[PDB]
Each structure stands twice: as structure tokens, then as C-alpha cells.
Design a protein around this ligand. Structure first.
Ligand code: CA
Ligand code: CA
Ligand code: MG
Ligand code: MG
Lengths: 548, 548
């Protein structure tokens, strides 16, 4: 069983996790000091957000050199030391491979915008690196992903006197995947890092690579043909290593990015479609939305493994839901206008659940109990909040809060001089929410989280089991099984804020004794026709074993 | 129905609650400015600890003047407006009344220790206020309560040249209750406050009033008669007021202190024995002991009511349990030797339960669902902690933590200057635990507690209903019913730290559906033989109503 199947991932922005030189910006020297924390929390893989040189207009997803380390974060040596030390400790590391586009400041585009043919008469290698147009009329019927900023997907470079394509920001010019030179250019970039010992990538914005006139330009098969090339490259050149796709898409298109047994594609994809239904079912006290969405997920290849997440560095995306659901979400979870952005809500996990421990522990159990490898977003293990006064998605990207000293331990510089200012308010401020406190608090959320991860660690049916929903007779109770290697788990959870009664249909399991995973307290043995009755308190989760 | 029966009491010390002027001592003006806080919290009566002028040898139970107020706290006027402002907001306030003895600094005793007659020949009215002996030998066959500091119960005064009787500290001389002038004083002290519109008294040290040769000098009939005299007086002149006995004796020893229908005495007494038991049941995962001790409660007069609590200004008293019981408690709740004192444990509530919100709620619900007027202790609504770095039981008498400003909002004095220092530790310190945070946090403990007091208030069966334990078939689960006026309450509670299953014997209520007091979500109806199977999560509490 491959390593990425049993792994727990944890996502972080180097620039915001821990600064080590008082300049007010996170860095690899500082990240390297903290590796002990992550490891003993129960994290196996780190996934760092982009670390490359870049004018930082989409926080360094606008890459200006693929083989660099942004000055801010340290040097290539620091990076190597970081890597060596993660590895020393049993930690895997992966990064973000930004494939669909670069910054407008990349030397490549600086050459491209000269003209189609060089002033000395000769032709320009770099102009057919990008995607140009004269009138800029192609690919209408194409959505504008950054709706609150971009009015079109073609913009007008003056130096070139033509239009260029960008699904994202104007300064993030899209890369021409019809030019096979460009495919070799990125093959280089991935070799570069993989040679250093990096254990994989999360690859970014992958549906949008190839663009055909008369289609939406998402999930095209040519796109997939390209990706197939990369996984081919890795399957040959670097056995073991991981490829992980971000695809914000409906469930039938999302599965496509695993490929087939015969034509393998990605090792992992994020389960984007389950994550909103989690929040929705919460507010509706109705888990149906969850059952439907999981029931629309085909078997994936032997090698595939789902990637499960609650939140991340981005807005809670609501693009891939019906209009009716979208509006309902906004009213229930985004009452103020500055809580919205693009087609999504820009908030951290805890503020979304109104800082309610009970609801928080609940939705983390379901993150753990589903089929996949879970990824934690940094700071949510201690219950960090947001600063909605920061532009774009910066309010969920504040500094990690280590203790109650200056800037919460992230830096010796005053908050004002940090790159993003650490939360100081009475509820979510570092005064009250920080790691050092919760390493001393016996009942803290951090201890709770460490202690539950460990519990999942001791049962592999979580990581590797099959799944099968149960009948509860009550939409607020959601039950399912996980079997793997002789182990049958029964996970029941109550999405209602008050007590709820179910009748569980355990017909398949007649004669078996249920017991608690924690302490094996015995429950009555299934009998009769196997209709097991239950009552459940507000937001309870029962994690169970069935013994034959 | 008499106000004291429905009410929720709240115990604070003025000296430690809020400081108006920055002297570093709480006082009435400061207290006055926090009355909205208390109104909104949900409580009905303020029990104040001793505010009388005193040298403070025995924490102000050593009184220098029963008709004044200690100067640290304010003036008689400050008190009158505090009282006018409490009342204006529907709060009753009661005070501490120390009947058996005064301080050696009381004028009475200073004037008493001259001699049986004056330097002008004439006799000395105040010689007979206290209790004198020539050889000091009477009243062997009586114990020395404070076995630690005191040797004798007679102490030699050189100025009077005689011995005086004192049950307590030698600076707390017994009043001479066989002298009728003194009974007059006791009545006049009580009348002073009752005129100001004080609503009642906690009456202190009653068993030891009268002392007789040849007895225990405890619980004597003569002493009961004075209290009847006392009760009689208040019924005549100030009807509606409350007299509550402080007195730590088993419930069947204490019933007497209510008196009888014909000859009233005290309106309320404390029930001590359940208190330790709730704690023990939790950690033994077994509730027999609670059932058993409510089972053994005597009948009490119509006007009677029991008082009932969790923690307070003193140590968790383990006098009222078996030795084997006392060991379990010390083993489970007092790992550190220095958490022990005086057959008790000197820790606040959240620390006792490892700051575990679930356990903390668990226990408060039961306190509030059980018969008896509950008294809550300042600071436990926000989960304050303790300072064992302070002597005696001053660990649990730290200043209230209002916000995260200087001295946690209590004073403008720096922490070192405050009367006792506010707690600053990582877990329970005012940077992390305070009112300002908890009001701003939609899911705080403080808000929860108000929710719950609201919930109690809506169902009179909690104040006036009878009590009937049911079966469950599993010790960790504790179920009972409250009934008054047609309404029937069913409150089920889980004392185990993991899921548990029960079979509730609801035979008396077949054909009836239980429903949630919170959002009125209903459950399966009761059917057949009336055995109603349940499941409960760790430390759950189910507050239910039964409809016909
Ligand atoms: Ca593209
Ligand atoms: Ca006496
Ligand atoms: Mg730095
Ligand atoms: Mg003062």
C-alpha cells in the first residue's frame, strides 16, 4: 500500500508559518525549527504553497522563475537543509507546480511581448510560448474565474499590440500547451526539484491547460493527454513520487484526472464536491446532500486515493453547486458582503462554525472517517480565525500563532511590520488562541486533534476501507461502514444541534457486538431483524467496531 | 410560591469582584457597575460574603462592628445605592450574619475585658456579653474544632484576668446567649440590615450558640429556641425575607434547623453529601451514590427548601464520605500532594475537571436539574482556575477576570498591588479567560450558562417538581423525572467518558412522546412494556419533556 494512502497531509505557506530573522516574513530557516511540532502532531506529509521568485500578485502563484527560491524565504541551501531534516524525521514534502501560467514578469513573457519575429529580422522562440490574438474574440462562452477583478480573459499588451490569454489575473499570462517546447520546459522544472529529493507536487489549475474554440476550455481530453505525459515521466524517471491534482469540478470530471489502470494520470485528487455539502447539511440538519454526492463517485484505479479537506488557503468555493444551493450558502454562512468573494466565502473553519467546539470536533471526525487522505490547513488544529479587512483571500492566510508573545511567536517584529498581520482580536487573537497554551491545556483542541489522528492511525480501515452508507431513518443522522482486512467500523454522526433518534439498519451484521473504538465499552448485540435503535446528543459522533 | 425556591444564587466577595478606584481592592461602587453583567448572566440572588468591619484574621467572619462596612469596600452610602441598583434590576441580595461570636476588636469585648465592674464602682453592662470563667475548667467533654492552632477552648486574658470561652480562633470570643441583652443585640443587628431592604442572611455558626455543662455544647434545644425567636421576629416585622443556615452536618441531622410547621426556624439549609458524589460518580463512571443519597432525604416543612452547590470559597469538603471513598477522590482529583488540605481538595472547578467543557457542562446541568436552589460561585461561569502559590484556600479567591487589560480588568493597579493577584498562567490566565472574550464569542461557556439558566427558568418543575429515579440498566447513566403542575420532566445524564447504552424504564408513561426542551425536537413515543432503549455520547445530558 503506497505511502500517500496512509499519510496525513498539512498545508502551509512558508511566508506565514514561522519567520526566523525578524524581517517580518516567514522563511525556511524558521520552518525548519518548527518541524518537531508538525511531526508530533501526527503529520506525515507537508505540502508547501509556492516558494518561487515572483512579484507576488497572486501570492506567488505568479511564478517568475521555476528553479528559484524567493529571496524572502531564504536560499537553495536552506531549502536543502529543510528537506534533509524533514526526511530525517519521517516527513514527506511536496510543493505546488504552477503549470497553466506564469507571471508577466517571467523573462519568457518579456521576450514573447517583443513581436512575432525579432527586430534583426530573425524569428522569436518565445512568442509561441504564450497564447495570442488580434481581435480577442475567441473562447467566449468561457467563464471569468476572478469575477470580482477581471472583466475579460484577453488583455492588451502594448509592446506586442495583441491580446493574450489568462484564466486568472491579467498579470498571470496563460501558457500555450500546443507548443511542445513548453511541455519540455515544465518537464525541466519538475525534474529540477525531483532531483533534489522532493517527494511530489500538488499541480495547480490543471483543468484549464488546453483551450479549444467552441468548448468551455475545461477538462478537455488534450489537457488530459498532457497530464498523462507527466505521470509517464514520473512513473519512469522517479518511482515513488506523488502527483496531486487540484480540480474544482463536478464529480464525473474530477474522477477523470485519475486516468485508467492502463493510462494512469494522477495519484490523488481533492474531493472538492463533498466539502460544501458538509457545511450545507450542517445548517439544514439534513445529510442527504452528502450521501448523493458520495454516491455519484465512481470506483477509482487501484493506485488512486481521494484527498479530503475542510478548508484551505482559498475561498470556500461554491462555483460547482446549483444556484439554489449557492444562494442558500451565502445567506447561512456569508451574511455580510465582505464575507463573499468571487463565487465563494472567504472565512476560516472556526468562524464558519461560530467558534463552536462541538461542531468543530464533529466536522473533523467526518474528515477523518471518510475514504481518503486528509489534509489539514495550518492553524485550524488550534482554531484560528480570519481578518476580513485584508484584500482578496489574505484574511485566511494570517501568521501561525505559536504563543502569546510578540506577533504571537511568528516573529519578533511588531504586527504592523509583518507581511500579513497576526490576528489580535478578543476571540481569535493570539493572546487567547495559540499553541503554547494548548500544549499546556489538557482538554485543548490541539490535544483533541493529535489524540484523534492517533486514533485514526490505529485503524487502517479508515485509510484503506470500502464505504457503505447505512439507513438511519432520520436525515440528521449519517451512518456508514468501513471494512478492510477483517476490520468493520461503524461511524455514526449527528448533524443536528439537539438530540436525535434513529433506527439503524444493521441487517447485514446480525449477531455482532458493537464496541467503542476508545475503550471498547460494549453496546447491545445486534439481534432480530437487525434494526438497531439509537439516540444521539447534539453533534455527537460514535466511532465503533463491529465484532463477529 | 416563595421567591427563594425558584432562585439561582451567586456567591461573590466584594473585595475581589471589581475595583472602582484603583486602590487594588474591590468595593461597592465597582460592584455596582457590574450589576448588568449579573442581571444578564441569569442569576436571581447575590450572596455576598462578609462586608463588615474586621481585622481580617478569620477572613472577616471576625466582626468588629455588625452595623458598618469594612473601609476597603466603601461606605454605608455606597452600600445603599448598590442595594437600590440591585433591586431596580430584580436582584435579591443576602448577606453573611455571624451569630456565635465577635472579634476581640469589637467594642463590646474591649469594654467587657475591664472587669465585672467599672473604675467608678458601678457595674459593667458589657462584662456579661461574653463568657467568663475563673479557673477555666467547665465544658470538658467538648472538642476543640480548630485542632490545628487552638489547644484550649478557654484562653487567659490578662486585662480581665479571667478566661473566656471561644469555639474558634482565640480572637473570636463567644457571645453569651444566656444573657438576654445579647439576644436583643442579635435582633437589632438583623433589623439594621433588614430596614435597608436587605433580603436575607446566611446565618453562621448556629450549632454552637448556647453551651451547657455536661453536653456536646452543640445542637442544643436552648440554641434552637433562639433561632425560633429569630425566625419568629422576621415573620412578624419583615415578611418575605430569607434565613439560610450555614451548617455542615448530614441532612437528617440538619432537618431540625428548619423547625416545624408550627414553630418555623430556617427557610433553607445546605445539602452537602451529593456534592462530593457528583465528582466521584464521574470518575467511577457510576451514579449509584447520587441516587442513594437523594433516596435518604428527610421530609421538610412546606416553606422549607434545600440549597445545593458544586464549588465555593472553600475547599471541596470530603468529611462526609467513607475512608475508602476519600482515597479514591484524592487519587483521581489530587495527584499533587499540595492540592490537599483539611480533609479536602483546594482547586477550582475547571481544573478539577481538566478544563473539559463537556464535563463542566455535564455537571452544571445536573446541579440545575436536581431539586434544590443552586448557588454558583463567581468565576466558574467562565472557567477560571486556581493559584496554589497562595496560602490556605486563597487559591480559589482570585479576582474576577473581566478582560485582558491591566490586572485582567479588575483594577488599574498592576497585578502585584491587587489584594490577591489575578491569575496569569497559560491556560486559565486573564489573557485567555475573561468576560470580554466570552461575550464576544458566540459559543462561550458564559453564554452557554446563560442559555441554560433561561432553560431552567422556563420550566417550573425544576424549582418545585418532585423527584423520581428511573432504572436505565446501566450505572453510568443517571435518569430521573421532575413533576409539578401537569408538566413532566425527564433528565438523562451520562457520567462515562465514552458512549453508553441504556434501557430506560418508562412504563408509567406509555403512549407518550418525549421531546427536547431545546427546539422541541421530538423522539419515538413510549410503547409496549415501556422499556425505552437509549444511546448517549460521552458526558451527554438529555433534558426532555413528556407530552400526552
Ligand atoms: Ca491554459
Ligand atoms: Ca457560643
Ligand atoms: Mg524571513
Ligand atoms: Mg477599591
Amino acid at each position: 500500500p503506497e505511502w500517500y494512502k496512509s499519510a496525513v497531509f498539512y498545508e502551509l505557506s512558508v511566508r506565514t508559518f514561522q519567520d526566523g530573522n525578524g524581517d517580518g516574513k516567514g522563511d525556511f530557516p524558521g520552518l525548519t525549527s518548527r518541524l518537531d511540532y508538525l511531526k508530533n502532531l501526527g503529520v506525515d506529509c507537508l505540502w508547501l504553497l509556492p516558494w518561487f521568485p515572483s512579484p507576488l500578485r497572486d501570492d506567488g502563484y505568479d511564478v517568475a522563475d521555476y528553479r528559484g527560491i524567493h529571496p524572502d524565504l531564504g536560499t537553495l541551501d536552506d531549502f536543502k537543509v529543510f528537506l534533509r531534516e524533514a526526511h530525517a524525521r519521517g516527513l514527506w514534502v511536496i510543493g505546488d507546480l504552477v503549470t497553466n501560467h506564469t507571471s508577466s514578469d517571467h523573462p519568457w513573457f518579456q521576450a514573447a511581448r517583443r513581436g512575432p519575429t525579432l527586430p534583426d529580422g530573425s524569428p522569436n522562440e518565445y512568442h509561441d510560448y504564450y497564447v495570442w490574438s488580434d481581435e480577442g474574440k475567441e473562447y467566449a462562452d468561457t467563464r471569468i474565474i476572478f469575477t470580482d477583478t477581471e472583466v475579460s480573459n484577453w488583455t492588451l499588451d502594448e509592446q506586442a499590440g495583441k491580446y493574450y490569454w489568462h484564466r486568472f489575473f491579467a498579470s498571470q499570462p496563460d501558457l500555450n500547451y500546443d507548443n511542445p517546447k513548453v511541455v519540455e520546459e515544465l518537464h525541466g522544472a519538475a525534474r529540477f526539484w525531483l532531483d533534489l529529493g522532493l517527494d511530489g507536487f500538488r499541480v495547480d489549475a490543471v483543468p484549464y491547460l488546453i483551450e479549444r474554440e467552441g468548448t468551455s476550455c475545461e477538462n478537455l481530453p488534450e489537457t488530459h493527454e498532457i497530464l498523462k505525459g507527466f505521470r509517464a515521466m514520473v512513473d519512469r524517471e522517479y518511482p515513488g513520487r506523488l502527483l496531486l491534482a487540484e480540480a474544482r469540478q463536478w464529480p464525473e470530471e474530477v474522477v477523470e484526472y485519475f486516468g485508467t489502470e492502463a493510462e494512469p494520470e494522477f495519484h490523488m485528487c481533492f474531493n472538492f464536491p463533498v466539502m460544501p455539502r458538509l457545511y450545507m447539511s450542517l445548517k439544514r440538519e439534513d445529510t442527504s446532500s452528502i450521501r448523493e454526492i458520495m454516491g455519484r463517485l465512481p470506483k477509482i484505479p487501484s493506485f488512486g486515493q481521494w484527498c479530503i479537506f475542510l478548508r484551505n488557503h482559498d475561498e470556500l468555493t461554491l462555483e460547482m453547486v446549483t444556484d439554489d444551493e449557492r444562494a442558500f450558502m451565502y445567506a447561512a454562512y456569508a451574511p455580510d458582503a465582505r464575507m463573499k468573494i468571487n463565487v465563494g466565502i472567504r472565512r476560516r473553519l472556526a468562524p464558519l462554525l461560530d467558534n463552536d467546539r462541538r461542531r468543530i470536533e464533529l466536522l473533523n471526525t467526518v474528515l477523518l472517517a471518510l475514504p481518503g487522505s486528509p489534509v489539514l490547513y495550518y492553524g485550524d488544529e488550534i482554531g484560528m480565525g480570519d481578518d476580513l479587512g485584508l484584500p482578496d483571500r489574505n484574511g485566511v492566510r494570517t501568521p501561525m500563532q505559536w504563543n502569546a508573545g510578540t506577533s504571537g511567536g511568528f516573529s519578533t517584529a511588531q504586527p504592523s511590520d509583518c507581511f500579513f498581520p497576526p490576528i489580535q482580536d478578543p476571540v481569535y487573537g493570539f493572546g487567547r488562541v495559540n499553541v503554547q497554551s494548548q500544549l499546556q491545556d489538557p482538554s485543548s483542541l490541539l490535544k483533541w486533534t493529535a489524540r484523534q489522528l492517533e486514533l485514526r492511525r490505529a485503524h487502517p480501515a479508515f485509510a484503506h476501507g470500502d464505504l457503505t452508507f447505512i439507513e438511519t431513518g432520520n436525515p440528521a443522522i449519517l451512518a456508514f461502514t468501513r471494512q478492510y482486512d477483517g476490520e468493520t467500523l461503524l461511524i455514526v454522526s449527528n448533524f443536528a444541534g439537539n438530540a436525535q433518534a434513529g433506527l439503524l439498519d444493521l441487517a447485514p451484521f446480525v449477531g455482532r457486538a458493537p464496541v467503542t473504538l476508545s475503550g471498547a465499552s460494549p453496546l447491545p448485540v445486534v439481534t432480530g431483524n437487525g434494526q438497531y435503535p439509537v439516540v444521539m446528543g447534539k453533534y455527537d459522533y460514535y466511532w465503533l467496531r463491529l465484532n463477529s
